[PDB]
Amino acid sequence: AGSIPGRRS
Amino acid sequence: AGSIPGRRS
Amino acid sequence: MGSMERASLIQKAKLAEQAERYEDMAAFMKGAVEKGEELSCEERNLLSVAYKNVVGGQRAAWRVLSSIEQKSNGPEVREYREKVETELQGVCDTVLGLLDSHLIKEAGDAESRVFYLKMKGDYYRYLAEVATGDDKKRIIDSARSAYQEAMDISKKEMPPTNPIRLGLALNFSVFHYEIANSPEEAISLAKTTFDEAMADLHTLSEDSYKDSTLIMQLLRDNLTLWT
Amino acid sequence: MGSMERASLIQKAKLAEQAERYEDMAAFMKGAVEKGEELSCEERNLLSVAYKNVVGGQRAAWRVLSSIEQKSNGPEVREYREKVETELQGVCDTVLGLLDSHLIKEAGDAESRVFYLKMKGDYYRYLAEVATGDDKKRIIDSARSAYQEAMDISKKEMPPTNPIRLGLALNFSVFHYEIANSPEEAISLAKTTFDEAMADLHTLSEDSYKDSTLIMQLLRDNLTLWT
Numbered sequence: 001a002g003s004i005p006g007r008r009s
Numbered sequence: 010a011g012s013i014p015g016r017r018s
Numbered sequence: 019m020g021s022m023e024r025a026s027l028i029q030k031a032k033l034a035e036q037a038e039r040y041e042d043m044a045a046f047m048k049g050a051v052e053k054g055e056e057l058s059c060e061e062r063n064l065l066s067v068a069y070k071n072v073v074g075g076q077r078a079a080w081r082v083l084s085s086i087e088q089k090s091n092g093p094e095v096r097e098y099r100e101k102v103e104t105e106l107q108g109v110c111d112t113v114l115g116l117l118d119s120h121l122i123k124e125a126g127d128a129e130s131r132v133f134y135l136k137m138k139g140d141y142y143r144y145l146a147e148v149a150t151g152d153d154k155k156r157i158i159d160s161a162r163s164a165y166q167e168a169m170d171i172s173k174k175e176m177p178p179t180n181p182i183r184l185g186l187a188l189n190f191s192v193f194h195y196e197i198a199n200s201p202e203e204a205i206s207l208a209k210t211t212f213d214e215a216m217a218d219l220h221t222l223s224e225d226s227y228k229d230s231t232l233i234m235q236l237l238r239d240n241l242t243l244w245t
Numbered sequence: 246m247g248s249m250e251r252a253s254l255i256q257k258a259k260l261a262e263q264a265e266r267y268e269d270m271a272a273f274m275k276g277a278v279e280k281g282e283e284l285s286c287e288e289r290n291l292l293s294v295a296y297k298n299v300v301g302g303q304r305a306a307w308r309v310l311s312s313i314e315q316k317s318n319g320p321e322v323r324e325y326r327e328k329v330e331t332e333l334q335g336v337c338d339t340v341l342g343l344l345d346s347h348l349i350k351e352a353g354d355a356e357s358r359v360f361y362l363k364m365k366g367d368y369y370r371y372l373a374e375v376a377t378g379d380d381k382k383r384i385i386d387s388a389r390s391a392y393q394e395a396m397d398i399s400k401k402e403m404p405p406t407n408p409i410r411l412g413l414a415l416n417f418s419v420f421h422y423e424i425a426n427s428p429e430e431a432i433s434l435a436k437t438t439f440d441e442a443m444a445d446l447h448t449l450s451e452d453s454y455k456d457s458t459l460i461m462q463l464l465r466d467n468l469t470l471w472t
């Protein structure tokens with residue numbers, strides 16, 4: 001399913 | 010303002 | 019892309035569009051143009067979509083960086099805005115070079131010639147957005163001249179509802195408003211274009227009506243923002 | 246990026262994030278790692294965000310192309326899926342190379358060491374997603390081994406609500422479900438992680454509670470899809 005989005009920081 | 014989006018075709 | 023077949027470049031440009039890989043899409047369509055043959059209507063649209071997405075991302079990034087730089091006024095923000103700006107200019111120069119070698123000179127039908135001259139106006143307009151000074155003046159005139167030649171052909175050769183004619187008028191009005199400091203010219207052009215298209219809708223099929231009314235709504239949206 | 250100051254690379258990576266220029270962001274953070282100094286918590290997050298966005302776009306494109314190729318079963322779709330796949334593998338190998346030279350070996354605190362080992366597991370997992378055959382087996386084991394070492398450290402050294410510990414458990418559960426064909430292990434890990442975090446929320450400030458509950462909701466979302 002979903003992993004940590006991790007695309008904002 | 011807005012030009013033709015032109016980004017899909 | 020010299021070793022890849024023309025038809026394979028076109029097929030891969032369509033795949034790249036589906037995959038949202040617009041840099042790849044533009045490289046494949048550049049390769050297809052450099053085969054030297056004229057482009058069909060569908061192929062012209064692939065070329066234009068690819069580069070509009072590439073330069074559209076660069077313009078959005080340039081605007082973010084330009085806003086940060088103006089608020090700041092070390093060298094890093096200016097340096098990085100300059101890097102993005104140089105990359106954007108390079109993409110615009112590449113598109114302009116394809117149009118000049120040799121798409122426009124071989125385009126004899128009104129639909130192809132107007133399409134390419136509108137692109138020429140658009141890519142000079144994107145150069146003008148980042149240009150500063152007297153450089154700006156000659157770039158602005160180059161955009162104006164391309165748009166004006168396209169307008170002259172479109173008014174003689176295409177009906178007022180033709181989607182290329184409509185999109186050209188829309189973009190030239192944006193040029194007037196945003197680049198040329200001519201908001202009244204922008205509003206006049208958008209209103210006249212909209213009204214002349216309205217009067218010609220009765221001639222169209224259901225599908226052509228949908229195509230033309232979509233662009234007419236963009237003209238109306240600008241008129242609403244401008245008035 | 247050898248001639249640019251470390252601090253300027255970090256500043257430009259933050260600007261690139263604001264401009265949504267993730268390829269640039271990753272190149273600046275690669276340059277910062279190659280300065281040879283350890284990364285702070287904020288700098289590790291910049292590195293991870295940059296590469297997650299780059300490889301996330303490549304994975305999305307690979308999935309589009311892989312789906313078209315499977316439906317088709319000329320050489321163009323396979324060739325272009327292979328091109329994207331090679332580019333994706335190259336980005337994963339670059340990240341893995343930074344972790345191996347020399348981020349992991351110099352990471353002594355649990356927060357840095359777990360962070361880098363979770364990244365190692367994630368980038369081997371992205372390699373596994375495109376791998377075929379016995380190659381897949383060794384790549385899958387490399388992902389598993391990195392995740393397991395990170396899990397072992399996190400359970401000894403971090404509270405069950407620590408966001409890195411939570412995100413590691415989330416991603417390892419996805420590895421079990423999607424890569425290792427172990428859906429029961431995935432569901433068990435997600436449930437145990439969620440329940441142990443729930444029981445430790447009472448110890449947290451309002452801001453730490455928000456950080457931990459956000460990731461707990463991702464665990465719950467997967468459990469809902471999996472059960």
Ligand SMILES: *Cc1ccc(S(=O)(=O)n2c(Cl)nc3ccc(OC)cc32)cc1
Pocket residue numbers: 013015017018059063136180181182184185186229233
């Ligand atoms: C500058 C401009 C871009 C797009 C359009 S459109 O109506 O959306 N369009 C596309 Cl994307 N491709 C087209 C081919 C042919 C026409 O009309 C003949 C429109 C069109 C219009 C203008």
Ligand SMILES: *Cc1ccc(S(=O)(=O)n2c(Cl)nc3ccc(OC)cc32)cc1
Pocket residue numbers: 004006008009286290363407408409411412413456460
């Ligand atoms: C793998 C993973 C990615 C992001 C997160 S988080 O909670 O969204 N996060 C980010 Cl983006 N940066 C962080 C620094 C420190 C923590 O907790 C100590 C979380 C965090 C978690 C896991």
Ligand SMILES: [Ca+2]
Pocket residue numbers: 023024
């Ligand atoms: Ca040929």
Ligand SMILES: [Ca+2]
Pocket residue numbers: 250251
């Ligand atoms: Ca230095």
Ligand SMILES: [Cl-]
Pocket residue numbers: 097098101257
């Ligand atoms: Cl720079």
Ligand SMILES: [Cl-]
Pocket residue numbers: 056124125126127
């Ligand atoms: Cl011709």
Ligand SMILES: [Cl-]
Pocket residue numbers: 030324325328
């Ligand atoms: Cl290819």
Ligand SMILES: [Cl-]
Pocket residue numbers: 283351352353354
């Ligand atoms: Cl250390």
